[PDB]
From Swiss-Prot:
The chain holds residues 3459 to 3696 of 4092 of the full protein. Residues 1-141 are annotated as: AAA 5. The gene is DYN1. It is found in: Cytoplasm, Cytoskeleton. It comes from Saccharomyces cerevisiae (strain ATCC 204508 / S288c) (Baker's yeast). It comes from the Eukaryota. Cytoplasmic dynein acts as a motor for the intracellular retrograde motility of vesicles and organelles along microtubules. Dynein has ATPase activity; the force-producing power stroke is thought to occur on release of ADP. Required to maintain uniform nuclear distribution in hyphae. May play an important role in the proper orientation of the mitotic spindle into the budding daughter cell yeast. Probably required for normal progression of the cell cycle. This is Dynein heavy chain, cytoplasmic. Present with 195 molecules/cell in log phase SD medium. Belongs to the dynein heavy chain family.
Length: 228
């Protein structure tokens, strides 16, 4: 409805202490601890141009585009498990060691001010700072191997793109049967679980493995016409 309207555009009438907003008729006081979110379920439903312009539109939608992204993660786990293992920790320990570098700098300054009049305790943190000579240079060790890992990651996106582009066209096709008939539904997870079974010219053979496994699992939930 229109009335929220002044609450969507940031309009207010300010007072000495009170902040008032006009809603339909009554002028009501705004807190400031108050937050607003608007939630919608169907993308088909169209929102007013007033709102769409003042509103930050964010799509939490598990699209067909999401399938291309998610088949590469499954492919790489079964194609180069050594580099998919190191992918997660590469950006994890990038941020974690830098947060621990900031956590140890704070520990050093706390004890340097407390144990300046006390015995040479700082030394007990300096052997932890001796351990930091692995940590500071661990980052250097990881940054060096990153410049080696990233261009290899980008080399592996291409093959999976070749796999990826066919799989969406296949999901599109199976999705479209559900549009004709109610019983002909497919989830993204059903296609993923099917593509996992595909493992347990290499790119060309895996492609042929996909088409076969999809024909194998999803042919069953269709009638003779839709099979053909």
């Amino acid at each position: 409805d229109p009335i929220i309207s002044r609450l969507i555009s940031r309009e207010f009438n300010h007072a000495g202490n009170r902040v008032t907003v006009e809603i339909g008729d009554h002028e009501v006081d705004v807190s400031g601890d108050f937050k607003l979110f608007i939630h919608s379920c169907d993308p088909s439903g169209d929102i007013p141009i007033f709102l769409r312009s003042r509103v930050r539109l964010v799509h939490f939608v598990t699209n067909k585009e999401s399938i291309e992204t998610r088949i590469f993660d499954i492919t790489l786990t079964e194609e180069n498990a050594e580099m998919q293992r190191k992918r997660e920790d590469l950006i994890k320990l990038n941020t974690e060691y830098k947060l621990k570098l900031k956590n140890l700098e704070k520990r050093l300054l706390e004890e340097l001010n407390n144990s300046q009049g006390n015995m040479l305790e700082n030394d007990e943190l300096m052997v932890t700072l001796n351990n930091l000579k692995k940590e500071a240079m661990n980052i250097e060790k990881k940054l060096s191997e990153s410049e080696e890992f990233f261009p290899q990651f980008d080399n592996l996106v291409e093959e999976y793109s070749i796999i990826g582009k066919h799989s969406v066209k296949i999901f599109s096709m199976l999705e479209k049967f559900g549009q004709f008939h109610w019983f002909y539904g497919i989830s993204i997870g059903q296609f993923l679980s099917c593509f996992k079974r595909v493992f347990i010219t290499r790119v060309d053979e895996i492609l042929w493995l996909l088409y076969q496994e999809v024909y194998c699992q999803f042919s069953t939930a269709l009638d003779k016409k839709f099979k053909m």
